[PDB]
């Protein structure tokens, strides 16, 4: 093995400088295979042959050799192999598909490498898999981020990754997940409502965003959430048969501008359901419509 070490080192020193398509490369690789005939349990020479085959760039030969080497060594030393073959996934010219499958093989043995995976997907504009794995790890509640990100941090990441890539997640349940997260996010309810509304907007389902903002105003608890959500709704009405439609735009904008004191009063009371003085002012908000004042009394 040390004799084999000298042999392999001398071979790799001797073929250093020749072209990749020389006989010498295959000869040194065959000598390395003859060495692994004896030393299947050797992580050192295995990583040596693996880095040398990386310098060969033989995707399929290095692939078969990696698949054989990881299985030939006990688990406790494949780590020194992972940081090797992982770097190979970062090497260009091989399929992204093989990288994805090898990542699925890796993250099933040590899942704490999750964020690295996410980065590569962000590094490929494959948002339909990035957001998918992010929502996966967003419900695997035991997961502990490697970069120190909060569950809320990856949550905002997945919110943005759904909203900006509303076409890319086709096949997934964005609506239910964002809703149940609004049942898990207590600090950004208005933000989540507005984000899901914009995600429904960017898919041409304006009525779905309008119903979203409706259930948001009917679901908000604090004044910030209803303020931000109704501000989004007013901007959406302002932005979204030509003359009749422009006048309907003006009419709904007038609607919501007449409405903002109404709803802001509503959430002022959502904050303090027994604040009688704000009830005084909100009763005065409804002068001219005495039915409203009787209802508010």
């Amino acid at each position: 093995y040390k004799l084999w070490h000298a042999y392999l080192t001398e071979r790799r020193l001797a073929v250093r400088g020749l072209r990749p398509d020389d006989v010498a490369y295959e000869a040194l690789n065959n000598t390395f295979e003859r060495a692994l005939v004896s030393m299947h349990k050797m992580p050192r020479v295995w990583l040596d042959y693996l880095q040398l085959l990386m310098d060969q760039r033989l995707v399929t030969r290095t692939r078969r050799t990696f698949d054989r080497a990881l299985g030939s060594l006990p688990i406790t030393q494949h780590d020194r192999v992972w940081a090797l073959y992982l770097k190979f996934i970062h090497t260009p010219g091989i399929p992204v598909e093989t990288a994805v499958r090898l990542y699925r093989r890796y993250l099933k043995l040590e899942p704490t490498h999750a964020e690295e995976y996410v980065a590569y997907l962000k590094a490929k504009n494959r948002w339909g898999e990035a957001a998918r794995k992010l929502a996966e790890l967003l419900n695997d509640d035991t997961f502990r981020s490697l970069e120190g990100k909060s569950k809320h941090q990856l949550w905002l990441e997945l919110c943005d990754m759904i909203t900006k890539h509303p076409k890319e997640v086709e096949g997934m349940r964005v609506d239910a997940i964002i809703r149940g997260g609004i049942r898990r996010f207590t600090d950004e309810v208005g933000r989540l409502w507005t984000s899901l509304a914009d995600y429904y907007i960017r898919r041409g389902m304006f009525e779905k965003a309008r119903d979203v903002y409706e259930e948001g105003l009917c679901s908000v608890i604090t004044v910030h959430d209803f303020s931000l959500i109704y501000d989004a709704y007013t901007q959406f009405e302002e932005s979204l048969d030509d003359g009749n439609d422009v006048d309907l735009r003006l009419a709904r904008l007038e609607h919501l501008m007449n409405r903002r004191p109404e709803l802001l009063s509503s959430v002022i009371l959502r904050q303090n359901p027994h604040n009688v003085a704000e009830w005084h002012k909100r009763v005065k908000i409804f002068t001219g419509k005495p039915t409203k004042q009787i209802l508010t009394y």
């Binding site: 065959n30 004896s38 997940i177």
Partner: protein
């Protein structure tokens, strides 16, 4: 005996009238008595007197009543109920017409209960529409003109929504110019009858049973697509369910309520009226939003004088789409405003409907019509898997009287005979059937165990007794309450810690307590002794699944032992919400007993979970050419991309034989076999004149220089039926094999698997059975053909009884041992080739691949290119032996005769070395996956080319299989007539879809739809829901084309003809006709088969010492005397076996065998003393059947059990029972009539053998005329044998 008289009596109606004036229900208000009906129908009252002489000029109420009650009792008993009317249908239509008015009789004209029986007969007709004569009766009531029963606006909107129907509608009118409202008048009469019940000193049970039967009839109507197609809108306009909700019969605090729940689940099912397809969720949303929008528009246009209505109209759909919003926008309306809205603007009720003048009813109709309701998938996903006390005792759903289910009541259980709406409906019905069938056995287990507990008072509970099936829990508290998944409104996981005491261990009970493993089902039961629910005060019973046993260190791996068990989180969440809203107790702390049960008999909950996952799977991943076949609807079109040319190989032993097998197929023998005459193997090509097959002979590529390396061969001279079955299995599609008794199913199936392994080396075979013995026989036949044991494996949860182990650990052992041998072989190969460092090439598995390329292949290429240059030279060809580079390896070669010969020998030895290296590379997995379980996963997922298992194991393993990336292309299954529906459909989805379409290409199902069906613990589920009918039998019932195995080769033909009449052209093989082992008669009896009469025995015949324990001491004594006389004749006792059609006969027979013969040195014991159904597939030389029953014919009248118990013999059968009892039943007569063709007295020869079956015996044949003479004979004979 009356119809066989020379002058048969002329048919007379006076006798019928006399019968009606009595024992017949007609004249009465009460329904006809069942015992009398049993006496009458079993007397063939319909098939012989009623139906054969029935006429319109003679028909009345009494005749139709007798016929309807007889048809009902015939369906209740599971006998043919249509053949008599199909034999003579000239009068079958007219009665049917007079049937409808009989159902359309007004109240007090004809008996109510008689009209309930009429409704039941009409339900059976609507459910038996597969018959043509019944089809001509159901068509005119189930056709398009049924829309002529609708309101004018109803049909107008119907033609406006789908305009293209209107044209055909006019055609109907045109067709008229040169029945439709039967269901509608029935529904109006049903609403009236219901209204005639007092909601709140009691009403008649007739009305309740009528409503329940009508709900069952409507359920069967709307569970079947073709009849519901146009009855759906008819029942919708009929507003029947809306009344059924706010009826008086409904609020009566049960059967009608559950059947109305079934009707509500069915009438809103997501199935398309004309398209017949399942509607998506977006379609449902669009339909609900459309109708709601229309309603809003109507309110805007018709309700402008009512502010609230206008506000509701102005609001979006989703705001007013709920029930709260519906109740919040109406009660402001006057009755005229509600009528204007509902009848004119929305048209939900015709202005001419008698109920269109009632305010509250109209409001209720409006509320029912408009509400966002959750889908069926949501309803299923919100269901528990385990029941509580509300279902455990209720015989309305889960049965008490269900063991004694007479057929007389309706039951709220969905039943499917030929198909379903779609796939999801079948899945829900099968899962519900499995749950409700397991429910009765769970009730039995709990009742017995908590009876054994002897629970008594103390506000405590003290146990006078103990149960090995139930231990009292000492501590019980839930520790794990997970948050819901998004969308889900229930817990994601509920576990609880439960600690109980060993108490008196008794070196067994304590060990059993430890037998808990993960997923095993236990139950926490809370009971309150008042002194079975009344007995021990059992209140709550909730089940759980132990996840792991916790050791004394807090890790989920004295006498106090604790477990973490996961309970039903959905039922738990329901109970929690109900506690929070209704202040109810938390039963999660009130449990005080924990009970577990058997591992084999506790598979229900896991199968429910798998059926639920199948109910949640995104797509119908089944091949679309099989969804319609499994649906029972559409042309099967799944029979055999037909591969024209396929390799049959070792199928035919001779070229001539292949031609002989198929009568319609021409022989074009292309002889490339190197022999003068055609020889195996052979290739057969099928055309696409055209009845010709092109046969190309082939030579198997040499496997090397070793003669023992030659591949094995199949040897069975398969007949044309077996050849056609293997051919259908060889081409893609559905193959249905109906194989008779001993017709060679296992051989043809193993040949099919071998041809699959051979013609397509990239495809695998999935083998699914019902039993482990079937897999044993399949593997015993597989090893007998050239199929690599490295490519076959069998999974199971047992005894290894073959020579080889196809278990996963057997695969691990084969892989490891062959890996060690292979490395040594490689090392030997190197050393001999003079390669330096020969240890380094064989040291590493990967290296061996480099040695193959550099040292083996490159020596072979130099050899071939040297031998070609030498052959060109004209030098002696021995040159192959001179140049061959592997001479020292193959020392443990070339003939020099011809160029091609030595080239083939060299190529073969090279392919041998290539196979050695390929097996090394294939076993590299065991050097890459250390753990044996990882190696099992690697074998099933990558290497295995035939993966075998059973139905229960496949159900348990579907989840983990689809998880572990399992793949398989073609599947074969035996016992296809004994596998429950879900158990045979399950093995199709043990893997995910590829590109969105199924990878399944061949579905081979072999069985006998004439043999015994699957097992049901509860005899009520077969009576009511017909759940024992298998999927293969249902397919064949629809008209699935099947190859009929018609060559029996294991039993005597004179014995075979006793049951071969149930099959198509099932004959006898050459050996059964020619082998003297079949022409040998039985010693000690003149005849090789005889029916033995058994009269009363001291005033006793069939007796029942216990409840339901039917035995016959006399026939048992006679069978024991026969077996003892045979064992005195020297017959091998273990070659003779005793079976019985009731377990009581087997128990009494065991007692008598252990009392009278037991300690004898001359007398042996039978092979098996067991049951007819407990002898399925088994065989002996001599069979002795006990027909103990004498008063009731019993379930031995079934054709399936008759065939089974008639084909359990190979050489000799002795059947002992009341002959007149069995002769009186027509269904078994075809067999029984044969048994009457010989004497009914025991014919023995106490002095004898080499006699022939037909030839005259050369000794005096003695006759025993009764069991007493048999006993005297056996006593005296044994006495004379003992002094010798």
């Amino acid at each position: 005996e009356a119809r066989a008289q020379e002058n048969p009596p002329a048919f007379k109606p006076e006798l019928v009238q006399t019968i009606y004036k009595q024992e017949l229900g007609g004249a009465s208000k009460r329904a006809p008595g069942h015992k009398r009906i049993m006496l009458l129908e079993i007397s063939q009252y319909l098939e012989n007197y009623l139906w054969p002489n029935f006429d319109v000029e003679k028909a009345t109420f009494e005749h139709v009543m007798s016929l309807v009650l007889m048809v009902n009792e015939k369906f209740r008993e599971g006998v043919p109920a249509w053949t008599c009317f199909h034999t003579r249908e000239d009068a079958f239509p007219g009665f049917f017409k007079r049937v409808l008015s009989l159902k359309d009789g007004r109240e007090e004209e004809l008996k109510l209960h008689e009209r309930t029986a009429y409704v039941l007969f009409m339900i059976r007709s609507f459910q038996s529409l597969e018959d043509e004569m019944v089809r001509a009766q159901v068509l005119r009531l189930v056709s398009l003109p049924l829309w002529h029963a609708l309101s004018p606006g109803r049909l107008q909107l119907e033609l406006h929504a789908h305009e293209a129907l209107a044209k055909h509608w006019k055609a109907a009118a045109k067709k008229e110019a040169k029945e439709t409202r039967f269901l509608p008048a029935l529904m109006d009469e049903f609403l009236a009858v219901l209204d005639q019940v007092v909601v709140p000193p009691s009403l008649n049970r007739g009305a309740l049973l009528y409503c329940e039967r009508f709900l069952e009839f409507l359920i069967d109507l709307l569970s079947q697509l073709p009849t519901r197609r146009f009855v759906r809108t008819l029942i919708d306009d009929r507003q029947l369910l809306v009344k059924v909700r706010m009826s008086g019969l409904f609020k009566y605090e049960l059967l009608y309520r559950q059947l109305v729940d079934l009707f509500s689940y069915y009438m809103s099912f997501p199935i398309n009226d004309h398209t017949g397809e399942p509607l998506t969720d977006d379609e449902v949303n669009a339909a609900h939003y459309e109708k709601v929008c229309q309603f809003q528009r109507l309110c805007f246009k018709h309700w402008q004088g009512v502010e609230a209505m206008q506000e509701l109209a102005l609001s979006h759909c989703g705001a007013v789409e709920a029930r709260d919003t519906l109740r919040r926008h109406l009660a402001s309306l006057t009755g005229e405003q509600v009528r204007e809205l509902v009848c004119r603007q929305l048209r939900l009720v015709g202005e001419d409907d008698p109920w269109a003048a009632d305010g509250a009813f109209l409001l209720e109709v409006l509320l029912a019509a408009y509400e966002r309701r959750r889908s069926q998938r949501e309803v299923v996903n919100e269901m528990p898997l385990y029941p509580t006390e509300g279902l455990l005792w209720d015989e309305s759903q889960i049965p008490a009287s269900s063991e004694h289910y007479t057929g007389e009541g309706a039951l709220a259980l969905p039943k499917l005979n030929l198909q379903f709406l779609t796939v999801a409906d079948y899945l829900l019905r099968s899962f519900h059937l499995f749950r409700l069938e397991a429910t009765y056995e769970v009730r039995e287990d709990l009742a017995d165990v908590l009876g054994r507990v002897g629970a008594y008072t103390g506000g405590r509970t003290r146990f006078a007794g103990w149960a090995r099936m139930a231990l009292p829990l000492t501590s019980f508290k839930v520790t794990e309450v997970r948050k819901p998944n998004v969308g889900e409104a229930k817990p994601a996981g509920v576990t609880a810690n439960v600690v109980i005491d060993t108490r008196p261990l008794r070196g067994d009970v304590r060990s059993e307590w430890d037998e808990l493993k993960q997923h095993d089902v236990l139950f926490l039961l809370t009971i309150r002794p008042p002194d079975p629910a009344e007995k021990f005060g059992l209140v709550y019973v909730r089940g759980c699944e132990v996840i792991e046993l916790r050791d004394e260190g807090g890790k989920l791996m004295g006498t106090a032992r604790t477990v973490t068990v996961a309970l039903d989180t959905a039922q738990y969440q329901i109970d929690m919400n109900t506690m929070a809203r209704h202040k109810s107790e938390d039963p999660y702390a009130t449990f005080n007993l924990l009970m577990r049960r058997k591992p084999k008999e506790n598979n229900f909950k896991a199968v429910l979970e798998s059926i639920r996952d199948l109910m949640n799977d995104d797509t119908a991943v089944i091949p679309p050419w099989l969804h319609d076949v499994f649906l029972g609807y559409g042309d099967p079109a799944a029979a055999q991309a037909p591969l024209r040319t396929v390799d049959f190989g070792d199928t035919f032993l001779d070229a001539q034989h292949v031609v002989e097998a198929f009568p319609q197929f021409k022989v074009s023998f292309v002889n490339k076999s190197g022999k003068a005459v055609p020889a195996p193997p052979f290739r057969i090509t099928f055309p696409t004149a055209a009845g010709e097959l092109v046969v190309e002979a082939y030579v198997p590529p040499d496997p090397g220089p070793y003669p023992q390396d030659q591949p094995r061969r199949n040897a069975v001279r398969f007949t044309p039926v077996q050849v056609e079955a293997i051919a259908s299995g060889v081409q893609p599609g559905l193959t249905m094999v109906v194989g008779p008794p001993g017709t060679g199913k296992t051989d043809t199936a193993v040949q099919v698997m071998t041809c699959l392994y051979h013609n397509c080396p990239g495809q695998r075979t999935l083998l699914i059975t019902h039993s482990n013995q079937a897999l044993n026989d399949l593997f015993s036949k597989i090893m007998e053909r050239d199929v690599p044991e490295r490519y076959l494996l069998r999974l199971g949860m047992a005894e290894l009884d073959t020579e080889q182990d196809f278990s996963r650990v057997g695969r691990v052992n084969a892989m490891l041992a062959r890996r060690l041998e292979l490395l040594a072989e490689v090392e030997k190969m190197a050393r001999q080739l003079g390669v330096p460092e020969a240890e380094s090439v064989a040291y590493t598995c990967e290296t061996a691949g480099y040695f193959w390329l550099i040292h083996v292949l490159a020596r072979w290429e130099k050899f071939t290119a040297a031998v070609e240059r030498a052959r060109a030279g004209g030098a002696g060809a021995a040159v192959i032996a001179e140049l061959f580079p592997f001479k020292e390896y193959f020392a443990d070669v070339f003939a020099g005769a011809s160029f091609d010969a030595d080239m083939e020998r060299a190529r073969g030895c090279f392919r041998h070395l290539k196979t050695l290296f390929q097996e090394l590379e294939e076993c590299r997995a065991f050097e890459m996956l250390k753990g044996q379980a990882d190696r099992v996963n690697y074998l099933s997922t990558k290497q295995a080319k035939i993966v075998a298992m059973t139905c229960t194991h496949a159900a348990l393993k579907r989840r983990e299989f689809l998880q572990l990336a399992f793949k398989y292309d073609n599947l074969l299954m035996e016992e296809a007539a004994q596998i429950l529906e879900i158990e045979t459909f399950i093995p199709m989805l043990l893997q995910k879809p590829e590109d969105g379409v199924s990878r399944l290409k061949r579905v081979v199902l072999i069985g006998d739809h004439h043999q015994l069906p699957p097992v049901v613990k509860n005899q009520a589920f077969q009576k009511y829901s017909h759940l024992d009918q298998s999927l293969f039998t249902r397919f064949i019932r629809l008209g699935t084309p099947y190859v009929q195995l018609n060559m029996q080769g294991r039993a005597r033909a004179s014995l075979a003809q006793l049951y071969n009449w149930r099959y198509k052209a099932l004959g006898d093989l050459p050996a059964v006709q020619a082998l003297p082992a079949f022409r040998a008669a039985n010693p000690g009896f003149v005849h090789e088969y005889q029916f033995v009469d058994v009269p009363d025995y001291l005033g006793r015949g069939e007796s029942e010492p216990l409840p339901y324990f039917y035995q016959n001491l006399g026939e048992a004594e006679y069978v024991v005397a026969t077996f003892m006389f045979m064992r005195l004749l020297g017959y091998p006792a273990h070659k003779i076996s005793i079976l019985t059609t009731y377990n009581g006969q087997k128990a009494l027979i065991r007692d008598v065998i252990e009392q009278r013969c037991a300690p004898y040195p001359m007398f042996g014991r039978p092979y098996r003393i067991a049951t007819v159904d407990k002898y399925q597939g088994a065989q002996n030389d001599y069979i002795l059947l006990s027909l103990v029953r004498s008063r009731a014919v019993g379930h031995l009248r079934d054709v399936r059990r008759l065939v089974v118990a008639m084909s359990r013999a190979r050489l000799g059968l002795y059947v002992f029972g009341r002959k007149e009892l069995f002769a009186n039943c027509y269904e078994l007569k075809n067999t029984f009539r044969l048994l009457m063709a010989r004497p009914t007295k025991l014919a023995l020869v106490k002095g004898e053998v080499c006699s022939r079956q037909v030839d005259d015996p050369v000794a005096q044949p003695d006759l025993m005329d009764g069991v007493e003479a048999m006993s005297g004979l056996v006593a005296a004979i044994t006495e004379e044998q003992t002094a010798a």
